[PDB]
Amino acid sequence: FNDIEARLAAVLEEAFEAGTSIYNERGFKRRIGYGNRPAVIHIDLANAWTQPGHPFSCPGMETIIPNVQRINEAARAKGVPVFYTTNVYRNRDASSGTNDMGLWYSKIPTETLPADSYWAQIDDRIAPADGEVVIEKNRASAFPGTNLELFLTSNRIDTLIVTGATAAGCVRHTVEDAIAKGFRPIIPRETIGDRVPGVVQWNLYDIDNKFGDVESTDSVVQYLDALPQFEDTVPKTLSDPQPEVEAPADPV
Amino acid sequence: TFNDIEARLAAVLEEAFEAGTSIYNERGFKRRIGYGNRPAVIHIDLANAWTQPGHPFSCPGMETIIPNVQRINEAARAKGVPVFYTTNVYRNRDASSGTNDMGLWYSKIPTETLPADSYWAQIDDRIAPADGEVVIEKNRASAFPGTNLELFLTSNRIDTLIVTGATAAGCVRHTVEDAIAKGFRPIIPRETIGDRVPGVVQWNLYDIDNKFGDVESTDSVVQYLDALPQFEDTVPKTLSDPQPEVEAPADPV
Amino acid sequence: TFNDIEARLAAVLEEAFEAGTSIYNERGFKRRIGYGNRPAVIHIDLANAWTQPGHPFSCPGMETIIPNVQRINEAARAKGVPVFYTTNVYRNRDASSGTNDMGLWYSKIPTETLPADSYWAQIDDRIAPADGEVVIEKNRASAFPGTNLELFLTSNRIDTLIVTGATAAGCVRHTVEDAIAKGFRPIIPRETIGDRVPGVVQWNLYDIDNKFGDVESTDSVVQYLDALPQFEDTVPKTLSDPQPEVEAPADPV
Amino acid sequence: TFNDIEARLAAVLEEAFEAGTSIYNERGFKRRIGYGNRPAVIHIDLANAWTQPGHPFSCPGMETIIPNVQRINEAARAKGVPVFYTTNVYRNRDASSGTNDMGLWYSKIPTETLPADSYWAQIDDRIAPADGEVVIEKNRASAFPGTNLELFLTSNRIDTLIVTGATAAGCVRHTVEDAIAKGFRPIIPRETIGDRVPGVVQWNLYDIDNKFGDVESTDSVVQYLDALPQFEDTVPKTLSDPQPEVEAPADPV
């Protein structure tokens, strides 16, 4: 419900159809596929995003969190690694040489996200279980400045299930980084949120076209339900075979 | 795409951008990063596979992108500004091989069609690199993963990165997100950005301007470059530009 | 008993050092990187597991190290210079776990003896972090992998990294060479470097000075920081200092 | 150097190593990382500047190193193992240019003597790359900064990296410690490691075996590769091998 959103949703679907035909003819929008040794990462489902009243609050939590709980419940039944990020700063004074906001402060209100405040805590409804990692990050993607890639590479993870907020911010930069670094991104659609119109729709479409597969939470839970116990999983060593299109030859 | 779809899409997207801009501004997003004092220009994939027709990566609109890229190059070269070019090409395109360089991007887009050293891999002749400009062969969307770009930028104290090229919903956006994260101010000259399906340039330049960099006109970029001292004399801005600060909400208990 | 091994090894290592230095000088290695203009100080792992006796990682010589480290801190905080501290600690020491953060360094050194938030993990009281100084919990030898150190150094345009701490044969060397590679001039104050077995401090400092940073006295570093402007007014040297250049050997064909 | 020093040096260094190993042993260091199941080989700078006499980077001992590198290569090529080669060369060697790729390493070693595409940049003929093998041009000591090596190793799930090459006191050590940090088990065939001044090979291989990788004989490495399944069929070891765990000390208060 909203004045614009019904029309925006309807016309964005038409634009999406059009684009999918061009993409499909050219051989884009291929399926990356689920791998065998997954990790789950919840991007910034901390109070500043899940609770109302912060500059970073996202609506839709009433639908995101139950779906996040279904995934957590499936994953921790197999001992799958679960990571959470909270985007917070220890030194919010942009004139100091030890400030950790860098240039993102020149774009978004980083000074409103103090480390170890209520706003920095992962939301109670999905509190971290024992052995799950909470990573405090300083930039949008969960990779820069954190140790997420040291866990994922050292422990041979091949699939990264990404959930969280926002589609137009931290989720997309994380997914883009993951496929480039070497991890298969699966995005469970109902767990992604944002705070302005259209951005969830068009960012998930862009992600599904070139960076990760956007799936239903039901698909993701069913996949985790069919997993062996994590300690017995082995990664897929190369990409899944694709219907290859042929490289055009030099015109001269 | 039928013109009724194009027409109605521009209209609803404008409604969405108006609405979104108000929310962002109210909350303190969409601030201006601003030009720094010691820039580099990088042209993302304005190589024949994107600029010429007949390849699966071909982007339309080059007729508008190329003369504007040239305006930037002319202003930059005049000042001795570093200009980098990238081309997204692969030395070993067999997904079954242990030294294939396509990795998992082959499971999403047709990377097998981009051979290194072919016609398609060369930079477009209309904007041919000048002596001393760097051409980087890259394997992933952003210009940073697996390349030496960040070594140039950090070791030579570059504070601003003018990003041009293709595509808005692919390589240009991931390069901009990486650059601001790493510490370089991204300025996107709006007219030098291309793509190949409806809506994507508009909504991706909207998202970039809101959280990752300042979308500007090529006119503004050229005026900035024209006002620079010679690159030899530029020194970088050492911290962020001061911002209108939003106050952190106090904890309810 | 008594075996004069320390003095015997120092005398013959000095003979090796004279020989190597002649070769390096002739070939044009061992050049001075020189101090830049906008410095940061990083103290590597001077936490209780290294500075206090009783832990598998304890280093002797802290009585010489800590006062020199304190001299640099006192000189740095007088100028508003950024000071960073690392502590190498782990939050999940169960190598069977998928969320263990020790990776493969557990197959070489006893990582499971370093718990985060224990006494052992705490920076030594004699050099307690002052307000605004950063404590980085790291998981690998160099202070860069898996941390946000590079984000501070690149975003705040730092050009010089003064490195102190433990050990010459572990964490200090890998940090120093990662620093010059990424673009930060490493200066090592000799007297603040420690280790726990013979020879390693000497030969690792020699190797660093030859190809990766300048090994100086703490006196020179304190004097550099004392002659510095306030940090807010410093700006980085934009390129390398000119070197006496050696000519490339001509190709046979 | 003086041969009397070479022999004195070898003998006294053995005393220092013996003593050091006793201490590492009483602390639980120097554990074995072990061979994994899915390896790649990397030859660090066995290019003409290092292998052939007459360059400032020339190394002695190639008559021993190269037959041993050839044995590894023959074994690897039989199983289809990925073999990578690096060469350390520069496209723009003018330190005052904003697009020079030498960075600050030029302020330490003579990087201006290493042109890309020169005779000196070529991989030595005796160990010439076979088709499918990758030659990586790199700009800094470790083979990881500014290159796509990590893209190959992570995307293709390599767990072990066999490192050969020049020098022990430079590019080989930085590459090995980067590798264990990133998540790849480093194996060093002792006979294939070279350098140009006294003692460095000995003390750098000691330091590496203590904390960063396993120094093995070439026979050991060849036996491993000969026992391997065909590369296409190998799967990586997903976590560390179990280690003899040392007791984490309790906090004194």
Side-chain angles (χ1 to χ4, degrees):
Chain A
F1 25 59
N2 226 262
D3 217 289
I4 50 166
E5 283 179 13
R7 273 208 84 207
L8 177 68
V11 178
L12 277 179
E13 179 183 273
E14 293 178 63
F16 292 164
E17 282 257 271
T20 294
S21 298
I22 298 174
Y23 280 133
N24 276 345
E25 297 181 301
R26 296 177 180 231
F28 282 73
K29 206 175 179 65
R30 313 219 281 215
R31 302 297 80 200
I32 191 150
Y34 286 99
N36 292 142
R37 187 161 163 93
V40 170
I41 184 166
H42 299 298
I43 305 295
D44 295 342
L45 247 36
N47 287 147
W49 292 266
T50 52
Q51 294 303 319
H54 192 269
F56 282 79
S57 322
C58 293
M61 290 303 153
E62 198 66 75
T63 312
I64 292 177
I65 285 176
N67 284 296
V68 173
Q69 291 169 332
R70 293 177 64 212
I71 288 170
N72 266 358
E73 185 194 315
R76 50 187 64 141
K78 301 293 164 120
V80 169
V82 175
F83 301 81
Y84 293 71
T85 58
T86 182
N87 188 95
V88 289
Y89 300 92
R90 303 275 171 189
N91 180 184
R92 289 168 300 123
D93 170 25
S95 57
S96 182
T98 44
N99 90 82
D100 50 346
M101 306 187 292
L103 287 166
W104 213 17
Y105 161 82
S106 287
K107 271 284 157 182
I108 66 163
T110 52
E111 356 60 90
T112 67
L113 297 167
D116 289 315
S117 49
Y118 167 78
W119 300 118
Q121 325 296 15
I122 296 307
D123 187 283
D124 290 335
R125 292 164 279 177
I126 46 175
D130 294 276
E132 294 186 345
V133 181
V134 173
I135 287 174
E136 302 195 332
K137 58 177 186 73
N138 296 156
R139 297 300 184 266
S141 171
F143 291 93
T146 81
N147 56 183
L148 179 66
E149 203 177 358
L150 299 190
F151 294 94
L152 263 36
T153 309
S154 304
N155 302 163
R156 287 38 161 132
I157 297 293
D158 66 1
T159 310
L160 194 58
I161 292 169
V162 185
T163 63
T166 62
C170 300
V171 176
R172 199 212 269 221
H173 195 188
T174 296
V175 171
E176 295 166 316
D177 273 0
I179 187 172
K181 279 152 159 36
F183 309 112
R184 302 169 180 232
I186 264 76
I187 300 87
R189 188 162 55 222
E190 304 87 345
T191 69
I192 303 308
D194 218 303
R195 58 179 78 88
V196 298
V199 290
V200 176
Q201 282 184 262
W202 60 62
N203 280 87
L204 287 186
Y205 165 80
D206 278 0
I207 286 172
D208 193 73
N209 293 324
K210 307 174 186 180
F211 299 108
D213 296 355
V214 171
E215 292 287 292
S216 57
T217 300
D218 285 359
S219 176
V220 178
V221 177
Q222 179 171 347
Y223 159 79
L224 292 165
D225 283 354
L227 235 252
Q229 279 288 312
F230 183 75
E231 59 190 313
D232 306 342
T233 56
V234 163
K236 291 189 167 197
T237 51
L238 295 166
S239 160
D240 288 346
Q242 294 304 327
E244 298 184 22
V245 295
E246 209 180 77
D250 291 22
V252 65
Chain B
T1 321
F2 300 115
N3 242 104
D4 56 272
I5 302 176
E6 286 286 341
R8 286 180 294 121
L9 187 62
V12 303
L13 286 183
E14 241 290 285
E15 291 189 320
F17 296 164
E18 242 88 79
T21 296
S22 297
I23 294 165
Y24 282 127
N25 272 294
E26 287 160 23
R27 297 173 172 247
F29 290 69
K30 200 176 177 67
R31 307 214 290 216
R32 299 295 91 197
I33 188 161
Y35 294 85
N37 290 171
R38 183 166 164 93
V41 178
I42 182 164
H43 300 300
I44 305 304
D45 296 347
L46 292 180
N48 287 139
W50 294 269
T51 58
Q52 296 293 310
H55 188 274
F57 278 73
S58 297
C59 290
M62 287 303 148
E63 308 73 39
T64 299
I65 291 168
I66 299 303
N68 280 297
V69 173
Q70 295 179 283
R71 295 176 60 206
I72 288 169
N73 268 350
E74 293 152 4
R77 284 174 190 163
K79 299 296 183 179
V81 169
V83 180
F84 297 85
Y85 289 77
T86 69
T87 188
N88 186 89
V89 290
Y90 300 98
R91 297 285 167 177
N92 179 178
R93 293 175 289 112
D94 165 33
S96 326
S97 176
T99 46
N100 87 69
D101 47 358
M102 305 185 302
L104 287 171
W105 214 16
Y106 162 82
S107 321
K108 267 287 172 189
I109 68 159
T111 57
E112 345 60 281
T113 64
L114 297 164
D117 297 317
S118 47
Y119 173 72
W120 299 117
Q122 304 170 256
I123 295 309
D124 192 284
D125 295 315
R126 292 169 288 189
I127 50 167
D131 293 305
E133 303 195 332
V134 178
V135 186
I136 290 168
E137 286 191 32
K138 70 175 180 70
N139 300 146
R140 296 303 190 265
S142 169
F144 292 89
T147 84
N148 55 174
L149 178 59
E150 192 168 6
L151 296 194
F152 288 108
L153 259 38
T154 314
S155 306
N156 298 161
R157 282 48 163 134
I158 294 306
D159 60 14
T160 306
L161 195 64
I162 287 153
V163 185
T164 77
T167 59
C171 300
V172 176
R173 199 213 271 221
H174 195 188
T175 300
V176 170
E177 292 163 320
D178 277 357
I180 188 167
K182 281 148 158 34
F184 306 104
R185 308 172 174 231
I187 278 74
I188 299 81
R190 177 175 54 245
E191 299 76 8
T192 67
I193 301 304
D195 217 296
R196 59 176 74 92
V197 294
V200 289
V201 175
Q202 293 159 262
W203 66 59
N204 282 94
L205 286 184
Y206 169 70
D207 286 349
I208 287 165
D209 193 75
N210 298 333
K211 302 178 188 175
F212 306 114
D214 295 346
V215 175
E216 293 289 286
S217 61
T218 302
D219 293 345
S220 294
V221 179
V222 177
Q223 176 173 23
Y224 161 67
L225 285 181
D226 282 332
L228 277 169
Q230 282 282 317
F231 187 76
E232 320 157 82
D233 300 323
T234 61
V235 282
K237 279 184 170 294
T238 52
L239 294 173
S240 170
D241 283 346
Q243 297 294 332
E245 291 185 12
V246 184
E247 187 174 270
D251 301 352
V253 63
Chain C
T1 197
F2 177 67
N3 187 32
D4 200 48
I5 186 183
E6 271 76 73
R8 173 168 59 252
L9 177 68
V12 60
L13 284 180
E14 198 196 278
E15 298 183 290
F17 294 166
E18 251 102 273
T21 297
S22 275
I23 302 170
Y24 283 129
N25 279 339
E26 288 172 40
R27 298 181 181 238
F29 291 67
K30 201 172 181 68
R31 308 217 284 209
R32 301 295 82 205
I33 185 158
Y35 292 91
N37 291 135
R38 180 157 167 95
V41 180
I42 181 159
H43 299 302
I44 310 291
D45 298 346
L46 291 182
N48 290 144
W50 295 267
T51 61
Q52 294 304 315
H55 189 282
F57 278 75
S58 315
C59 294
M62 289 302 149
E63 226 57 74
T64 295
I65 292 173
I66 295 294
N68 280 292
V69 171
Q70 291 168 323
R71 290 173 69 205
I72 291 166
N73 269 352
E74 294 155 40
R77 28 191 85 135
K79 301 287 188 179
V81 171
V83 176
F84 301 85
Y85 292 72
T86 59
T87 179
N88 188 84
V89 287
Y90 301 94
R91 293 186 174 277
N92 185 186
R93 289 172 295 113
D94 171 13
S96 298
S97 186
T99 36
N100 95 77
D101 50 341
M102 310 183 297
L104 294 174
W105 211 20
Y106 165 78
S107 329
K108 275 283 160 181
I109 64 164
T111 50
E112 76 287 358
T113 69
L114 292 168
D117 294 320
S118 67
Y119 171 78
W120 298 118
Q122 264 55 159
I123 296 307
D124 188 296
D125 294 314
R126 295 167 284 179
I127 51 169
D131 293 82
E133 291 185 347
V134 194
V135 177
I136 286 168
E137 291 186 358
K138 64 175 187 64
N139 293 168
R140 300 298 188 259
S142 174
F144 291 90
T147 80
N148 56 177
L149 177 64
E150 196 172 8
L151 297 186
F152 297 94
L153 300 185
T154 315
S155 307
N156 296 174
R157 313 310 167 195
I158 296 300
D159 64 358
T160 302
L161 194 61
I162 294 157
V163 181
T164 74
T167 55
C171 302
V172 175
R173 200 211 269 213
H174 196 186
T175 291
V176 166
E177 60 214 333
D178 264 358
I180 187 173
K182 283 132 149 40
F184 307 109
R185 304 168 181 238
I187 271 76
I188 300 85
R190 182 179 300 126
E191 304 83 348
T192 65
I193 304 300
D195 215 304
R196 60 180 79 82
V197 298
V200 294
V201 172
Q202 281 164 281
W203 64 58
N204 276 97
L205 284 187
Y206 165 77
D207 286 350
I208 285 173
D209 195 76
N210 294 326
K211 306 178 187 170
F212 306 110
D214 289 356
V215 174
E216 295 295 304
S217 54
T218 305
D219 291 357
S220 291
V221 176
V222 170
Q223 188 176 348
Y224 160 69
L225 296 175
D226 283 352
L228 205 71
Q230 296 290 303
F231 186 72
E232 292 186 62
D233 305 331
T234 58
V235 73
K237 290 199 167 65
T238 45
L239 291 164
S240 150
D241 293 334
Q243 295 305 136
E245 295 191 15
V246 180
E247 192 179 87
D251 285 14
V253 64
Chain D
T1 188
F2 292 131
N3 197 129
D4 48 270
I5 287 173
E6 176 59 65
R8 231 288 115 134
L9 180 61
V12 182
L13 287 170
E14 186 55 58
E15 300 171 40
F17 296 164
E18 229 148 81
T21 301
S22 169
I23 294 163
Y24 283 129
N25 277 340
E26 69 100 331
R27 288 161 183 252
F29 284 72
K30 195 177 183 67
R31 309 216 283 214
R32 301 297 79 203
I33 194 153
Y35 289 97
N37 302 168
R38 180 150 173 107
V41 180
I42 189 167
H43 298 296
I44 303 299
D45 300 345
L46 294 183
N48 291 148
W50 294 269
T51 56
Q52 297 300 315
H55 197 283
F57 278 74
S58 294
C59 284
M62 290 300 144
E63 329 83 45
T64 328
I65 294 168
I66 279 150
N68 275 294
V69 170
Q70 293 177 292
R71 293 174 64 208
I72 292 169
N73 262 0
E74 251 87 54
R77 287 170 176 165
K79 299 292 182 174
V81 174
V83 175
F84 296 82
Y85 292 80
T86 72
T87 179
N88 186 91
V89 281
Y90 303 100
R91 297 282 173 178
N92 177 183
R93 293 172 291 109
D94 173 32
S96 48
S97 163
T99 50
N100 87 79
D101 44 0
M102 302 182 305
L104 289 173
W105 213 15
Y106 159 81
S107 329
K108 270 290 161 183
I109 68 165
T111 48
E112 343 64 277
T113 67
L114 295 166
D117 302 328
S118 67
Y119 167 77
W120 299 118
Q122 259 89 84
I123 296 315
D124 191 282
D125 288 302
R126 290 164 285 178
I127 52 164
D131 294 270
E133 294 177 0
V134 183
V135 174
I136 290 175
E137 297 191 3
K138 65 177 184 68
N139 299 146
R140 297 298 124 95
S142 167
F144 287 91
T147 80
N148 56 179
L149 174 59
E150 191 165 1
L151 292 192
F152 290 107
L153 303 194
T154 314
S155 308
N156 300 146
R157 289 68 173 92
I158 296 300
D159 63 15
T160 300
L161 194 65
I162 294 159
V163 178
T164 60
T167 59
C171 302
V172 177
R173 197 209 280 216
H174 197 185
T175 302
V176 166
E177 47 204 356
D178 268 3
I180 192 180
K182 271 93 156 60
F184 307 107
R185 306 170 177 234
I187 301 296
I188 297 86
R190 165 167 49 216
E191 295 82 5
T192 66
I193 302 305
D195 223 298
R196 65 185 66 91
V197 294
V200 292
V201 176
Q202 290 171 262
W203 65 63
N204 279 96
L205 287 188
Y206 171 72
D207 288 349
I208 285 173
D209 190 72
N210 298 324
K211 298 170 183 177
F212 302 114
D214 296 347
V215 174
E216 296 288 288
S217 56
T218 307
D219 298 345
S220 181
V221 180
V222 177
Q223 183 167 359
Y224 163 67
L225 291 164
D226 287 337
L228 210 60
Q230 278 288 308
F231 187 74
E232 54 171 341
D233 302 312
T234 56
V235 287
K237 292 193 161 224
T238 50
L239 288 174
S240 174
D241 292 341
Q243 300 301 141
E245 292 186 5
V246 177
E247 56 299 322
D251 302 322
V253 62

